[PDB]
Symmetry: D2
Subunit: 286 residues, 4 copies
Amino acid sequence: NKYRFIDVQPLTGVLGAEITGVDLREPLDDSTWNEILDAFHTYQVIYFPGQAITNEQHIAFSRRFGPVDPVPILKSIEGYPEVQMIRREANESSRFIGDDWHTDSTFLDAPPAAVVMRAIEVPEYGGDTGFLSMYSAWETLSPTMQATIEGLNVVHSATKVFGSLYQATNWRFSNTSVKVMDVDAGDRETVHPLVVTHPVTGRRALYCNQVYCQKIQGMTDAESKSLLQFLYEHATKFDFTCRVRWKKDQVLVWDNLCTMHRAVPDYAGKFRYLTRTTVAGDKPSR
Amino acid sequence: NKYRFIDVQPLTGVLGAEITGVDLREPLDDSTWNEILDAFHTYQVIYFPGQAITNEQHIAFSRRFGPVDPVPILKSIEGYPEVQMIRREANESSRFIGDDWHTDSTFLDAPPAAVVMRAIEVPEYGGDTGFLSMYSAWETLSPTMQATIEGLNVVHSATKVFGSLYQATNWRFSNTSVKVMDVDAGDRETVHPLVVTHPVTGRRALYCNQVYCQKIQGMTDAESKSLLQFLYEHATKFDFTCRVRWKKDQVLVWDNLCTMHRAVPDYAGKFRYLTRTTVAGDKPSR
Amino acid sequence: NKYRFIDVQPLTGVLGAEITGVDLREPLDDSTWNEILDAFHTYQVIYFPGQAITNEQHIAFSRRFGPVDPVPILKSIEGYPEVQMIRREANESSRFIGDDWHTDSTFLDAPPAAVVMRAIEVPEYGGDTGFLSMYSAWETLSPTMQATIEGLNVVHSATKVFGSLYQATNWRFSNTSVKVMDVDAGDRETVHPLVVTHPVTGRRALYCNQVYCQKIQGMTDAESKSLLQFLYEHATKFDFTCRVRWKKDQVLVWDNLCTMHRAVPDYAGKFRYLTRTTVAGDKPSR
Amino acid sequence: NKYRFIDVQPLTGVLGAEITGVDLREPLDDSTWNEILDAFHTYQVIYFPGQAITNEQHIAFSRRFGPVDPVPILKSIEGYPEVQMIRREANESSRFIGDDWHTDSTFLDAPPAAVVMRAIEVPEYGGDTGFLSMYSAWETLSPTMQATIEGLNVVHSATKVFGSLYQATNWRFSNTSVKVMDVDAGDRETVHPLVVTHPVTGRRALYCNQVYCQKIQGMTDAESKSLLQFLYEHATKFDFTCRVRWKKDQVLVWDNLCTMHRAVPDYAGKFRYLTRTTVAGDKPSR
Ligand SMILES: C[C@@H](Oc1ccc(Cl)cc1Cl)C(=O)O
Ligand SMILES: C[C@@H](Oc1ccc(Cl)cc1Cl)C(=O)O
Ligand SMILES: C[C@@H](Oc1ccc(Cl)cc1Cl)C(=O)O
Ligand SMILES: C[C@@H](Oc1ccc(Cl)cc1Cl)C(=O)O
Ligand SMILES: O=C(O)CCC(=O)C(=O)O
Ligand SMILES: O=C(O)CCC(=O)C(=O)O
Ligand SMILES: O=C(O)CCC(=O)C(=O)O
Ligand SMILES: O=C(O)CCC(=O)C(=O)O
Ligand SMILES: [Cl-]
Ligand SMILES: [Cl-]
Ligand SMILES: [Cl-]
Ligand SMILES: [Cl-]
Ligand SMILES: [Co+2]
Ligand SMILES: [Co+2]
Ligand SMILES: [Co+2]
Ligand SMILES: [Co+2]
């Protein structure tokens, strides 16, 4: 709109934008990179159709957003530790990775700031990714509700994904993309604010997710359950979401602090493979 | 035990006490009155079996607790505007008065401080009254949850009892004990703190009830519902309750700021009649 | 793929398809019509980008699906009582029409079978419509849960939209697209099965929606709320939805028996105008 | 009332009765035993104040109700395997036994029919036992709701009490009354009807409890959770309960099929000791 070096097409009135008119196989001039970063901060999830980039170009483009660092759970392609896989063979019957709303690796003291995902080979239909804005979840709380919860922190851990709760369950991820982890690493706790300030935009976002949040720190289990449940229902209303469909060589970047996302498992029996590099963040803070 | 002019038998480890060794038809000396008042403050609901008092002695004893003032909704006995009736004819099929956890007349800017209820004729069994302590409901919230809610206020009105919500439904009280009221008086709102300090003991109590609380002030309807539902489920756990069985001429006093009570409707087809005088309070405050 | 006279691009693995290779301004031969109808039955919501049709061609094409009959609540365009408007002026501050999951006019003894909606002028982004499959909501109930509910009926009425519950609240639709209605018509109840069989495909679908369903027939209010809340949370999981973005002259048909839909209100301050003709149905049945 | 050999004083209009005018240290003539059994079947929980019986008289009186057989979890007094203890030392800080609504040992293929509990040494106040009627929970379901759930079965196991869920938790029972159990015995599942017919009275009772019920058989976890939650809330309404206060040598009998009960933990710091013998039952059936 204001953009002169890239073409940007917002996806909904809440978040998401398609970006075209740029070739990510080539270096970006300063002005072009500035518009891309501005679109990233405005729209929170941006995607570029039709970008046939090499793995190393994927690494370098990811590096423009900040330091790259893989997440603990995913396997990487041979010869690139930074390039992890979200790969599901046609014949799998295991749990689909990321099939509840979450944001990535929040059990870390410093979760990722962003992730850059690229479609290698995906079905003609099925396997969309949903996103939602945690800026919008926060802004649509009343001032009274905001003031009530803004001093709270939450305890996060990977116990349901690769810790003792996981090991107690029957339903596994396959070993196609997921590593065997140490149970104790799965159960290690960290604490983050329930309401964070984005370190670049200064905007505030609600920060909780059902995959990694165990409870509100200092609360009883029943108090915490009641509050977190309301927040999850509030944040995942359909009005705050968008939905991204993938095609081969679509490159997408999401902000891992101010958004949540989830896989859509509607392609059972079909091969699906995307790669991703993760961009490191600093300690979430209030 | 520490009591030397009255005999006090606590009812549970949470609230409630029977008081004997005293004849309420006779004046009470300062020593005996000081212990009764102390037992009222410690136990929150106190009752005196076997007190065959006149209506005037009921008014005079009620007056020892504070100025007496009837509640808006109840009919009074002929010749005593201060002595109101909780009366249900055997064959009534209407709603049972007070059959949800509440405390009285909290839609008033200044609800009653206490009520003094006396059994005239009651069933051999059935018609007990439940009580619970809102001191205990407050004290068993975590320090974190207490800090989270202590600054909130709640909007109260009588809309479901004698205002527009009542008029919209089809389940009525009979005219045995309940007056016809103005709908606009039913709908008038007041605001009270969600957490109050008792003006005599200085102790804090949770202050919300599903009968008169409409919503948390300043919150959205979904936010208010979520928090108030948790607080009602928390406060009405069986562990925080006691149950009083009535016998003819039992006289009982409850603190209308720090308890809630409810009628038990398990005597359909049997006559029940109690009288009560209400003791005025000041504006609930933090 | 099996389609040889139209090109069909399914939208997700659950429901929804784009149809191209056809010009709806021209008559359709039997072969092309049979495939369109087949795609409508398989995919439940179908849409045709780029169809600059007249209002008469919109009526004629709608008529191929079944007899056309407007819904009670919407204003129609001058000169075409069958062509109703979903129109929102940029500066409206009123409630957004259809902004909760529902299916249309289910308070009728015989709700519509289908609707055909056409974009006249819509925002560059914002104003998408969500859809979900009630075939999928039904199929993913366990066999045990299916047997448990299949004999139940639900009482429907328009009370919250244009009856006494609507009149009691303070959030209105504007008069741009919505007629003034009789309150007694708003409150009139009908009964439908909770689980219906589609009269053409023979497949079964869950049939309840929070906008028009009042309660499960024969149940208490607390029993009905409990079951209907579970079914709404089950049916509206993100996995069962698809999301359609509009562009000028996109024409879309949805099956009003086996889907639910909702408006997304993310375009406040921007003009939006679609027209629709509704296709009459028969009484929903087991 | 009709009783001529015993004096019976019902406790509420729902369940419970005090029985006097009999000495349980002596054998009962046929007529006296017939009235006691009739009062047991009518009132579901009966209690006899002031019965200073020996352990063997307790055994023999229990034997009149049917075969005696201890429950798996509780320690017994030396020299009487049939006489188990519910004993809590003044200094305990562990979990209170039986502090949620339940009925006993329903993880067994044939749970107890009844239990006979006798106060040895109890506090002056605190440590009441609540009871409720599952006949009343069932009768207050609508016919429609009754027909909906009457064919369902439920899976029960002791996993939360002495199985893997217990071992996962932090909060233990003390070893004062509770035995060390095998985890596998804790996790063994059985199936009972959700609605049972009492084998003597022929009356129907709802049969589920949060302590031992894992899920509705054949349902998904979310479907089962939703239904069981509603039933627990419905059954434990205060209106369906009574509350029994203990005094030394009170002997009480409860029907373990048609009632639920729970301990009240309001006596922290005070010694409490009751003994009990359990009477074996047959397989719950519909
Ligand atoms: C890769 C990603 O891992 C998951 C996130 C959510 C869920 Cl449900 C499962 C996994 Cl493995 C992450 O958290 O970084
Ligand atoms: C007497 C009492 O009135 C009621 C309280 C609760 C309920 Cl559910 C009904 C009434 Cl009339 C009061 O609030 O003063
Ligand atoms: C046009 C449509 O009307 C509505 C549907 C849902 C809602 Cl929330 C509002 C309206 Cl006016 C209908 O039911 O036919
Ligand atoms: C003795 C009794 O055991 C319990 C019942 C409920 C609860 Cl919460 C705990 C126990 Cl040990 C039983 O089930 O037979
Ligand atoms: O497969 C997808 O769409 C998303 C998976 C995901 O959550 C992730 O990669 O962290
Ligand atoms: O009838 C009872 O037990 C209590 C009635 C009541 O709530 C009241 O008098 O305010
Ligand atoms: O405006 C929309 O997207 C849908 C409106 C709707 O629900 C309807 O026309 O019935
Ligand atoms: O201690 C009590 O009041 C009851 C304990 C109990 O549930 C039991 O003995 O099975
Ligand atoms: Cl390269
Ligand atoms: Cl006065
Ligand atoms: Cl027609
Ligand atoms: Cl003996
Ligand atoms: Co993820
Ligand atoms: Co009252
Ligand atoms: Co609609
Ligand atoms: Co027990």
